[PDB]
Design a binder for this molecule. Structure first.
Ligand SMILES: C=CCNc1nc(N)c(C(=O)c2cccnc2)s1
Length: 294
């Protein structure tokens, strides 16, 4: 980009490529995302022009949006590491509980904010959660499946991760609710605690069945209306819910209680971000500094 010196490619996002770049003029270092073509929708640039005002300490700041040459560029504040990398870097020892708790609390603050402003993330995963040396964690790469759409990959040959997808999306719900973000965050919470993905499906049905095998195949009792969902099949196997203490050992009962509420099948029973913030698990929340190697 004529106005930026791509320092390096920092990823192949779900819409385009992401580069670390320096503003040749201001000297500020940013994350530049080049969006995918033949005119670009306007309803999108509005949805985007909306996210620019969605400013919060736990939401990656969207600095500028630029539509030019069938290319759409999003300029974001740069963060040095994502949670996926940090989790991999902490796999032998694990992220200390106080830090896991701080991160979970901050992400819920970010989601409570998004949700109170009627914005859904829709694609939370460790790779889209950015952290800095001061102990903050922020939501990045908001989905925008209602502003541009959800492509088969990202833009070119790239398998989309289904591990954090809410069951209602997998069952074909046409309208997502804020609850899909709580589900994804609960999956991330579990993963930070156990150091292993909770539901690592490699296909939509395998993702769905891995969820069913752990939480039990949903029925009308725990999820009213489930058997009437678009992709629900009466032929789905009937798995019994496994004991919850076996899922995230050795997480304490306060943590397990909160997680169970973030993982309720029925989107309406699923705890809201606002309510989760008041959960007993956060009585002793603090803000530790992570050990980051950059
Ligand atoms: C994690 C280190 C790179 N630094 C980044 N810093 C930011 N701000 C990044 C993003 O806003 C982002 C992330 C994933 C997909 N699309 C955009 S990436």
């Amino acid at each position: 980009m004529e106005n930026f010196q791509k320092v390096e490619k920092i990823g192949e996002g779900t819409y385009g490529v992401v580069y670390k770049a320096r503003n040749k003029l201001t000297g500020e270092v940013v994350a530049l995302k080049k969006i995918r073509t033949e005119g670009v929708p306007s309803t999108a640039i509005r949805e985007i022009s909306l996210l620019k005002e969605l400013n919060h300490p736990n939401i990656v700041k969207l600095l500028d949006v630029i539509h030019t040459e069938n290319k759409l560029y999003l300029v974001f504040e740069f963060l040095h590491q994502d949670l996926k990398k940090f989790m991999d870097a902490s796999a032998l020892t694990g992220i200390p509980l106080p830090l896991i708790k701080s991160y979970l609390f901050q992400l819920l603050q970010g989601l409570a904010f998004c949700h109170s402003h009627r914005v859904l993330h829709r694609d939370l995963k460790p790779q889209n959660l950015l952290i800095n040396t001061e102990g903050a964690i922020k939501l990045a790469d908001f989905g925008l499946a209602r502003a541009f759409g959800v492509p088969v990959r990202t833009y070119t040959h790239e398998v989309v991760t289904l591990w954090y997808r809410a069951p209602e999306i997998l069952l074909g719900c046409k309208y997502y609710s804020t609850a899909v973000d709580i589900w994804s965050l609960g999956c991330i919470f579990a993963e930070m605690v156990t150091r292993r993905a909770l539901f690592p499906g490699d296909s939509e049905i395998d993702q769905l069945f891995r969820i069913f095998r752990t939480l039990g195949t949903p029925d009308e009792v725990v999820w009213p209306g489930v058997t009437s969902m678009p992709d629900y099949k009466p032929s789905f196997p009937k798995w019994a819910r496994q004991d919850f203490s076996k899922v995230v050992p050795p997480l304490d009962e306060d943590g397990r209680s909160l997680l169970s509420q973030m993982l309720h099948y029925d989107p309406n029973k699923r705890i809201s971000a606002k309510a989760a913030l008041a959960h007993p698990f956060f009585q002793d929340v603090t803000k530790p500094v992570p050990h980051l190697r950059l």
